[PDB]
Amino acid sequence: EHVIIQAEFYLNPDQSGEFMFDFDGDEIFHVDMAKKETVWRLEEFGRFASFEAQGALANIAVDKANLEIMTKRSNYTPITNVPPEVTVLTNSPVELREPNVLICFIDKFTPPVVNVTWLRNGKPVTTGVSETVFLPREDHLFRKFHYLPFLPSTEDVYDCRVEHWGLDEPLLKHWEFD
Amino acid sequence: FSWGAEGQRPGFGSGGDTRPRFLEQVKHECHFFNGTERVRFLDRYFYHQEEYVRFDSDVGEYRAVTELGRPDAEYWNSQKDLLEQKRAAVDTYCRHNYGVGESFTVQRRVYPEVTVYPALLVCSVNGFYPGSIEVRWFRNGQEEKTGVVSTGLIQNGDWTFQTLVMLETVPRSGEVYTCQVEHPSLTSPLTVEWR
Amino acid sequence: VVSQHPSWVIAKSGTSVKIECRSLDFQATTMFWYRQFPKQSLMLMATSNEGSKATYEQGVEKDKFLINHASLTLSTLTVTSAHPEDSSFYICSARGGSYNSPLHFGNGTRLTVTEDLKNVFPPEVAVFEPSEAEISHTQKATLVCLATGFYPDHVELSWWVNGKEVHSGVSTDPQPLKEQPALNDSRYSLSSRLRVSATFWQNPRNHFRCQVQFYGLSENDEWTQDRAKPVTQIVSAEAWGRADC
Amino acid sequence: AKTTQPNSMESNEEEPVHLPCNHSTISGTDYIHWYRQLPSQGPEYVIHGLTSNVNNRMASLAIAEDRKSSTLILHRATLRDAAVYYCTVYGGATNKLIFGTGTLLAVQPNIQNPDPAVYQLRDSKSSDKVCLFTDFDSQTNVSSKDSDVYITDKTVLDMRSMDFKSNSAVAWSNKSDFACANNSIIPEDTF
Numbered sequence: 168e169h170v171i172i173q174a175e176f177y178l179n180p181d182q183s184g185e186f187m188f189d190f191d192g193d194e195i196f197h198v199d200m201a202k203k204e205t206v207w208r209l210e211e212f213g214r215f216a217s218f219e220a221q222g223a224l225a226n227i228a229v230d231k232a233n234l235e236i237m238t239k240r241s242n243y244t245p246i247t248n249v250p251p252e253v254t255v256l257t258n259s260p261v262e263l264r265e266p267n268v269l270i271c272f273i274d275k276f277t278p279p280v281v282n283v284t285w286l287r288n289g290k291p292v293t294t295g296v297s298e299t300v301f302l303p304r305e306d307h308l309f310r311k312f313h314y315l316p317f318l319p320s321t322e323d324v325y326d327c328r329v330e331h332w333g334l335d336e337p338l339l340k341h342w343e344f345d
Numbered sequence: 346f347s348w349g350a351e352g353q354r355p356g357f358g359s360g361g362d363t364r365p366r367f368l369e370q371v372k373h374e375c376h377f378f379n380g381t382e383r384v385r386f387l388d389r390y391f392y393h394q395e396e397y398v399r400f401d402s403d404v405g406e407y408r409a410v411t412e413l414g415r416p417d418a419e420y421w422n423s424q425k426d427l428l429e430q431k432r433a434a435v436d437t438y439c440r441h442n443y444g445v446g447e448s449f450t451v452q453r454r455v456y457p458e459v460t461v462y463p464a465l466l467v468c469s470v471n472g473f474y475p476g477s478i479e480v481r482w483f484r485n486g487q488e489e490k491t492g493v494v495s496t497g498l499i500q501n502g503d504w505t506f507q508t509l510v511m512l513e514t515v516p517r518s519g520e521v522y523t524c525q526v527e528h529p530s531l532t533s534p535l536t537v538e539w540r
Numbered sequence: 541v542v543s544q545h546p547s548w549v550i551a552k553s554g555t556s557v558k559i560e561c562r563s564l565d566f567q568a569t570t571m572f573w574y575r576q577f578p579k580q581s582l583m584l585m586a587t588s589n590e591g592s593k594a595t596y597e598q599g600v601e602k603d604k605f606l607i608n609h610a611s612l613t614l615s616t617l618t619v620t621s622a623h624p625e626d627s628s629f630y631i632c633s634a635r636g637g638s639y640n641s642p643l644h645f646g647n648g649t650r651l652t653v654t655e656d657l658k659n660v661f662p663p664e665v666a667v668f669e670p671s672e673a674e675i676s677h678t679q680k681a682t683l684v685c686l687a688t689g690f691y692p693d694h695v696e697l698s699w700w701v702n703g704k705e706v707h708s709g710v711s712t713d714p715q716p717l718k719e720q721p722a723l724n725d726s727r728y729s730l731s732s733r734l735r736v737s738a739t740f741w742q743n744p745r746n747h748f749r750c751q752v753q754f755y756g757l758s759e760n761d762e763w764t765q766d767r768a769k770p771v772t773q774i775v776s777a778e779a780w781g782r783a784d785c
Numbered sequence: 786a787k788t789t790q791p792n793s794m795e796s797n798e799e800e801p802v803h804l805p806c807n808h809s810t811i812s813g814t815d816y817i818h819w820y821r822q823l824p825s826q827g828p829e830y831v832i833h834g835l836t837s838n839v840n841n842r843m844a845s846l847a848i849a850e851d852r853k854s855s856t857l858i859l860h861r862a863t864l865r866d867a868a869v870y871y872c873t874v875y876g877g878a879t880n881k882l883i884f885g886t887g888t889l890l891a892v893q894p895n896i897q898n899p900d901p902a903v904y905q906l907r908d909s910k911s912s913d914k915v916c917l918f919t920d921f922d923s924q925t926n927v928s929s930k931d932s933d934v935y936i937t938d939k940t941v942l943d944m945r946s947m948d949f950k951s952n953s954a955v956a957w958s959n960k961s962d963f964a965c966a967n968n969s970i971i972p973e974d975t976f
Contacts, residue, residue, distance in 0.1 A: 168378050
């Protein structure tokens with residue numbers, strides 16, 4: 168029936184950590200390490216529950232200290248890049264003159280470090296964009312979603328520009344209205 | 346009110362753009378079956394993508410998963426307080442959070458809108474919660490099980506799902522095609538015709 | 541176990557005091573820093589997570605204290621611009637983990653700040669011997685110790701019968717009293733009582749010593765006055781069993 | 786921080802003491818913790834629990850069924866059990882340990898037979914200008930008030946293995962018009 172997962176990591180030598188909760192594959196929330204704040208994935212959840220943010224940093228600290236410990240114990244055996252599988256689609260089905268959002272799904276990668284840009288006709292666009300943090304997978308790679316609201320037009324042609332060390336060059340997923 | 350977290354303790358030992366990476370993961374996992382009736386708790390430790398040591402509530406102590414975690418199993422299993430705590434997690438953490446989260450995760454419901462069109466008929470169902478859903482294709486009141494192919498369940502990432510179930514049709518306006526969706530948000534099958 | 545250093549600290553205004561908190565037998569993921577003023581409770585100042593900028597509690601003066609957490613075995617608090625108002629009890633604790641991992645406390649560092657080290661005096665110690673009305677009227681022998689004219693009140697009075705410390709019979713004042721109430725850097729003064737049976741105090745074959753350990757200036761410290769430098773030291777007093785007269 | 790205690794409690798030795806704490810908003814993921822602090826030391830752990838009862842050597846913890854209050858139980862109070870006792874919450878919702886104002890516990894020595902008296906001890910070297918005052922009722926309030934004269938408060942010594950316990954209190958001055966028994970408040974059969 169259900170799964171809840173508290174999923175954290177620490178990454179050398181970027182020195183970045185993340186702390187979040189997963190419910191049946193969605194994020195309940197995550198802590199903004201830098202801002203020391205809890206961010207609920209939907210605004211409402213925070214009306215029904217609270218989570219004290221600074222606790223996560225304490226966790227991250229232990230994560231760090233373990234990583235340092237493991238690194239050595241493995242004789243500094245590092246991580247093997249594992250390139251992502253982008254995919255682009257639409258929230259609702261497409262219609263002309265009717266508003267819509269463009270989901271870019273970045274799956275099955277690692278380490279959880281990536282660079283996603285949104286362009287239209289080969290030119291960078293970023294008005295209204297949004298993203299989620301690195302999310303967990305049972306195979307212990309990550310997912311990640313980037314969002315771009317937009318307007319159905321025949322002329323416009325969108326691409327989700329996605330870069331990652333496992334890749335050998337940036338990666339484009341064309342999308343256009345059909 | 347008030348969500349709970351599980352912590353960690355240091356393993357056995359000490360501290361402390363093309364450069365090699367090192368990743369540490371911890372996953373504290375609560376599995377619920379039939380609400381909070383049977384619950385299982387896994388304290389999971391990862392190097393890169395490899396599970397090296399584990400606490401499984403059904404076992405009762407930490408156990409090495411690979412040879413890497415061997416020294417962590419012994420180490421942690423000697424902290425009798427750590428074990429006492431992890432053994433309570435099924436109730437103090439899992440059952441706890443299920444209760445705090447219940448009304449807006451487990452009980453969250455959003456209506457599917459099921460549109461139907463071609464561009465072989467696409468019956469496309471969008472923005473519903475939770476994922477559990479049935480999409481049946483119908484041919485004059487008879488369920489077409491063959492020549493149906495689908496998208497699978499698609500997780501939008503924002504607490505909604507969408508799924509596209511396409512039916513192969515003999516391209517003549519022979520008869521009515523009913524795409525019928527069933528979902529915990531609905532009390533009666535939501536049908537949608539095309540002829 | 542966790543040890544703070546130093547235990548006792550006397551500092552002149554505007555200097556900077558460094559306290560070390562070290563977890564001897566474990567990796568500390570989090571160190572906490574508390575301080576406690578007289579009559580009052582423990583209050584959290586800061587939280588340090590290893591390899592990170594410490595977080596301070598609200599109401600806490602931001603720039604005044606500085607944590608340096610670099611070891612996972614060591615954390616260092618530094619008080620800057622020592623002000624008399626920072627004379628307080630300072631306590632750290634190390635935690636070997638996060639949620640529900642036990643805190644292990646240092647045993648504290650007692651800090652006194654005085655604008656002039658010329659205020660620092662070591663104690664004078666005097667043993668007074670059992671009365672005899674006491675012995676006649678009641679059958680017991682009560683020695684009285686007296687440490688007078690010292691500053692600050694960083695002492696540790698102990699009793700040593702025939703070469704070993706004793707605890708039975710002892711009752712030390714729980715608090716130094718000050719000689720000049722109206723006065724800022726009033727010297728302090730303490731008493732203690734040691735009591736045994738008439739039978740055992742009248743025999744001059746055994747020996748009573750009142751010991752007072754003063755915590756004063758280190759030899760890193762700077763002494764201008766003529767009088768002997770009030771460094772950390774001991775000041776005892778003595779008397780033997782006293783048969784009848 | 787999220788707890789509430791009586792600021793102080795009085796008690797006799799050899800009797801059990803029940804220290805009360807309210808914590809009515811405590812989460813079911815946090816634990817109730819108790820610490821004690823001696824007069825100049827760091828605080829130390831005494832006990833903690835989740836629900837129902839917990840016990841260890843010399844000390845127990847009784848948590849109410851609804852977890853909205855709890856009690857620290859000292860089975861038999863010694864004189865050294867006198868401390869500040871702190872009721873705190875700590876757990877899965879609470880990662881910092883905050884100490885509230887606590888409870889200041891006094892353990893009255895049970896003074897078997899009062900033996901009141903104001904003695905005069907002579908100086909070992911005639912160095913300094915000193916009256917002892919011993920063996921008196923626990924509730925005897927000994928009240929100093931002089932510039933040159935100094936006068937401590939009551940304290941209690943424990944001749945262990947003699948099961949005896951005394952109530953020393955000391956007075957001394959500098960001036961030459963100071964004698965013993967002369968003093969803010971006192972008993973009758975004294976000296």
